[PDB]
Ligand binder design. Structure first.
Ligand SMILES: Cc1cc2nc3c(=O)[nH]c(=O)nc-3n(C[C@H](O)[C@H](O)[C@H](O)COP(=O)(O)OP(=O)(O)OC[C@H]3O[C@@H](n4cnc5c(N)ncnc54)[C@H](O)[C@@H]3O)c2cc1C
Ligand SMILES: Cc1cc2nc3c(=O)[nH]c(=O)nc-3n(C[C@H](O)[C@H](O)[C@H](O)COP(=O)(O)OP(=O)(O)OC[C@H]3O[C@@H](n4cnc5c(N)ncnc54)[C@H](O)[C@@H]3O)c2cc1C
Lengths: 649, 649
């Protein structure tokens, strides 16, 4: 059988990177266990456009994140904040985990969230060199096609940014503390310099730009290949077809189609690991030094819980025999991001409209994204952190795509066809998403697609009999996600209306109408914000206001009608994390509290969600785990011209 | 490790009965492997009101079919016929399988379906004695509470059956051949005799009645207990706390929390089974004679496929190492039933509406069902079997319950609140549901909650360039589920229109109006049927009808709008079966075609779905399996006064 010093469970964004550099920088035997196998020869994965269904059979037309051959199908419990819906969120199953199946938008997350929401030792300056390593190993690219709509939008954001600065207000969504009075929006002059949202020093917290950075590389023939954690760190230059490491990496052994069951303990020391191989026969792996769990946000706590680490009372109740350490926090504090969708219609001469919307087609260097920004809090969000006026937090990720991004049922109901040549999509993604959830295993036997995953989003506040003033502080906290989602709509509404101006100024005979959610409803909202000011959101709870005006019943009704849209007209991001966070399940050194030699090194260990997509943070965490395990800053101090060399096969 | 003569996988509706009676009638070593455990001491299962959430924690308020601790979570692939939805369909996990978590409505299925849709040897007279055994072992009870609305609905149906008989027409939904000219509707006079839909000879194919039959028994203290496969056949009188048989049953061995991975073969002969226990350790069980799979419609074909039985090219493509027999049909032909919901509002004085709607509350003896019938084809359904006029087929199971049975998102859009005191639910369940789907494993390693389950329902027909005449027979077959669902609405509409009469005749000063779907639409539908006749469903494809009149575009429009309602205003049943049906994956003696000694004895073997709920048919199959294996009609001939004895613990 196999015996190792370090056993790593899960070859995701964290596991791949962790295994790679541990083998390089030590002479220990590194054993990496993965539930799936490599997909280096699969065009659905290695062609970036595979994400959009280029290679889908027309009879089984499903994305990788809908496909059990490519992923874990994590079906959550009924969402009490979304009509009982049960969304299915995926973890990639294969070399590289979810980076094997994601949309490849690589985003650091910015300085502020690490300086403020992570503990000492995990502040932005403690992690920035590792983020730099994660980026240069991928070496991501920018959009190869400039679209007129991008510049018109950027020019629209600039005008708004100037108004917000000129007004002198303390907090608003285009303000950026590190750039002062100069609107931090990329210019549209002919040879303008790009603004980099991943800038090394974290200056660009709030920033508007023309391009994200995509995880693809160009091959000699001009085609693009997916550049993910899988083929960057486990390609054939480093790991052969039998899974044995090569050369300086020969201590590494990578087991494919190996589904891990439990960590076996002696006292509070892990000494072995279970897994079922591709034939369905169970094997034992002996452990000499450490076990590192990197199985993703949904499934890392399930491994710990199946292993005897969690709420003893609960774990006993479903039949876990061998209990190890009692910590009720295992699996709690699950966070995510959330993207409510908006649709816009372009009016005007068909030829002028076709011109205005040109160059937006998805290709590998943009994956569909034509902008736009990382934005801050709306001035009227009552739930800002205390120091939001002295440091600039990230709140919204503003993305613009072509086409109609609402689900098919919403397309039917709204009358908005994906084949109209005059519609496009704006999304204000909440990346400081208030809701919190938890994960519990339902059975002790085997790893399952579906543990109990509780995650309630846009819940309602039920009024009590107490005086109103005693209720508002509780309601403000409960309604926190509805409030942020609706204000994101107002941000897009503002943007669209300046675009009406900057589009004419750029010579386009067009005008724009927000059509999803209803233009009529959004207008009323915008007006409501100006009429009722800081406390507009009280009308989510109409009975406690006692405004018996025709105008008051009407705004309360508008908020009611609008509360529908973030519930069904949205796409839950697949950015789940924090379910075993630092200070709750593991300590500052990623060691699982209560054990001698178990660590967690994936996104489940994260103290707080990064301000943006989550791939970069995941690989960053595994990267720091490399130096923590070796006891020297090998990875932090590695020069930036030293990268893994890509082998496509 | 263990050794047995017959190894049974899954203690479901079939597994429990098969294990019980095999132990009794033979001296063989019978080993029953079950993934879950007994819930004899869990009030959520053994108290029938637990199904409705009596013991649910208020913060995790979820039914058993939503709970991984009680069930497998079968999330299906996106439904191309329902806006991409992914409903999650459960199999119970524990002693009694799905009978442990279901709504307990015990229905045989009627004679016609077995006489016409099952193979030689499985005709009604071949199976009726086994059905009789299944019923007397449970001994279901009828509703303990007569409600006025039931009698009002029945008297309305009587009037409708009489019009249908009088008209001399060959096929309609209240006609029943075996009872001729006497309307087969239970009488509502004071001391009327009940109609039994499960009558032994199968006379009542189409029949209206006041009560279904529930799987509960009354205890001496007046409380009701759930009477399911688990505690009927595997309670402490028969199997001790260690899973070992008692007395005459000592050959039986029941292993709990045993998740089976594969069946091991030597040649085309099974010699073993592997399983994972609750500690996460794999065991091997030796097989001397036979292996019987009774793991449910979703998971029976997955065990075979993981074992090397199925489409070889595909099983290779996902990494199954050991192939055994090539049968591309394994897992194909999956069927289900489907229940679109209708909501009715009662108008009148609040006190008189309240009286009309009294006594409809769910209690253990009715589980909410207050009627009503098994109905036949609507006369304007073009997809009847050839002999639909010489034998009476079951097509709709018409059920009436209290409250508002549409999903929460639909309650909001329609304004139909579950707390309005004046709404009730009528359901015409398509129990000859046209759609056919299939199951394939996504990975070779382990049993999973979520294999690929493709099941597309209310798909659209896309017109080709061919002449209309060549397309209609295709369009007729494609649109079959939409056609039947809509006609189900009309059946309810007709009933409601007569109930307006019969409510006055019974002294209720109320009026009834169908409000979900919109009354206007159903009205327009009813007129459309009389106007365009047999070829009304052509207007699903308006461009092929070339009717550009206002009356024509309007009817085409009415149908487009109604197609929305069965897709989202409904509940997919958990009556899945036929995925390893007789004549395709197994032969008439339940043996897996291609093996020496493997059988399938659960609902996945079913040739065609029973005309009604599926528990009974499932146990019926397990029952013949007892006789088929032992080679004698032991069970067919056992006297009906010899029943299993109930032990509550
Ligand atoms: C559809 C989709 C779109 C996304 N879009 C983007 C994007 O555009 N940009 C971005 O920055 N991020 C995106 N992500 C998120 C990003 O990819 C993840 O956050 C990142 O992979 C998380 O890193 P991780 O190591 O913690 O998790 P994972 O990458 O998911 O690592 C999990 C690995 O562990 C394995 N594993 C799990 N359980 C077991 C077990 N019991 N035994 C053995 N192995 C196991 C899994 O097979 C998997 O390989 C998206 C993800 C998805 C699924
Ligand atoms: C929510 C719900 C409501 C329903 N309501 C009704 C109703 O009102 N009336 C009605 O007649 N029917 C209803 N049923 C459906 C009916 O109960 C099923 O069709 C019937 O029980 C089928 O039984 P079965 O033998 O085919 O398999 P099942 O009853 O489903 O049992 C299969 C068993 O095999 C086990 N198993 C699966 N895989 C493995 C493995 N790898 N290793 C070990 N064990 C395994 C499962 O745990 C399960 O215990 C309902 C079902 C559900 C879930």
């Amino acid at each position: 059988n196999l015996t190792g010093d370090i056993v790593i469970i899960g070859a995701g964004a964290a596991g791949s990177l962790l295994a790679h550099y541990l083998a390089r920088f030590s002479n220990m035997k590194i054993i990496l266990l993965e539930a799936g196998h490599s997909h280096f020869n699969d065009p659905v994965v290695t062609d970036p456009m595979g994400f959009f269904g280029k290679y889908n059979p027309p009879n089984e037309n499903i994305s990788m994140s809908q496909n059990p051959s490519y992923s874990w199908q994590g079906a959550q419990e009924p969402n009490t904040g979304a009509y009982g819906n049960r969304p299915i969120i995926a973890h990639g199953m294969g070399f590289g985990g979810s980076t094997m199946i994601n949309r490849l938008n690589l985003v650091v997350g910015g300085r502020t969230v690490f300086d403020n929401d992570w503990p000492v030792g995990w502040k932005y300056d403690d992690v920035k060199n590792y983020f730099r390593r994660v980026l240069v190993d991928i070496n991501p690219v920018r959009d190869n096609t400039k679209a007129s709509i991008t510049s018109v939008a950027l020019d629209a954001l600039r005008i708004i940014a100037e108004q917000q600065i000129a007004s002198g207000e303390p907090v608003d969504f285009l303000l950026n503390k590190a750039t002062g009075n100069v609107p931090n929006v990329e210019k549209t002059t002919p040879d303008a310099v790009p603004l980099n949202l991943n800038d090394y020093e974290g200056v660009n917290s709030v920033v508007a730009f023309s391009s994200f950075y995509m995880g693809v590389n160009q091959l000699s023939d001009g085609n693009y290949i997916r550049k993910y954690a899988g083929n960057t760190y486990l390609n054939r230059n480093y790991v052969d077809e039998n899974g044995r490491g090569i050369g300086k990496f020969s201590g590494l052994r990578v087991v494919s189609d190996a589904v891990v069951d439990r960590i076996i303990f002696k006292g509070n020391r892990a000494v072995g690991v279970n897994y079922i191989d591709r034939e369905g026969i169970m094997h034992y792996v002996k452990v000499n030094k450490e076990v590192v769990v990197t199985s993703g946000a949904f499934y890392t706590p399930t491994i710990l819980q199946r292993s005897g680490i969690g709420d003893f009372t609960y774990l006993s109740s479903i039949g876990v025999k061998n209990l190890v350490y009692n910590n009720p926090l295992v699996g709690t504090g699950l966070k995510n991001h959330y993207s409510p969708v908006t649709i816009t219609r372009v009016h005007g001469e068909p030829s002028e409209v076709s011109r205005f919307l040109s160059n937006m087609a998805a290709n590998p260097t943009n994956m569909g994204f034509k902008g736009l920004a990382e934005l801050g809090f709306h001035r009227l969000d009552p739930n800002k952190p205390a120091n939001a006026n002295t440091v600039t937090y990230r709140k919204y990720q503003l993305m613009m795509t072509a086409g109609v991004g609402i689900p098919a049922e919403q397309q039917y109901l709204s009358g908005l066809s994906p084949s109209s040549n005059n519609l496009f999509t704006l999304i204000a993604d909440d990346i400081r998403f208030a809701p919190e959830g938890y994960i519990k295993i339902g059975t002790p036997n085997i790893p399952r697609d579906v543990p109990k995953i509780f995650f309630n989003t846009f819940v309602t506040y039920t009024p009590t009999s107490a005086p109103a003033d005693q209720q508002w502080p509780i309601a403000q906290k409960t309604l926190a996600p509805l409030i942020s989602a609706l204000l994101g709509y107002d941000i897009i509404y503002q943007t669209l209306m300046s675009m009406n101006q900057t589009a004419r100024d750029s010579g386009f005979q067009v005008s724009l109408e927000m059509v999803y959610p209803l233009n009529d409803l959004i207008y009323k909202l915008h007006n409501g914000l100006a009429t009722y000011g800081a406390n507009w959101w009280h009308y989510f709870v109409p009975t406690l206001v006692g405004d018996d005006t025709p105008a008051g019943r009407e705004f309360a009704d508008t908020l009611s009608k609008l509360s529908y849209y973030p519930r069904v007209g949205a796409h839950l991001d697949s950015h789940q994390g924090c379910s075993c966070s630092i200070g709750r399940t593991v300590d500052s050194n990623l060691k699982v509290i209560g054990t001698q030699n178990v660590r967690v090194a994936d996104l489940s260990a994260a103290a707080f969600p990064p301000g943006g997509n989550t791939w970069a943070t995941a690989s960053m965490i595994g990267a720091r785990a490399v130096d923590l395990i070796l006891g020297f800053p090998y990875l932090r101090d590695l020069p930036v011209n030293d990268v893994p060399i890509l082998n496509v096969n």
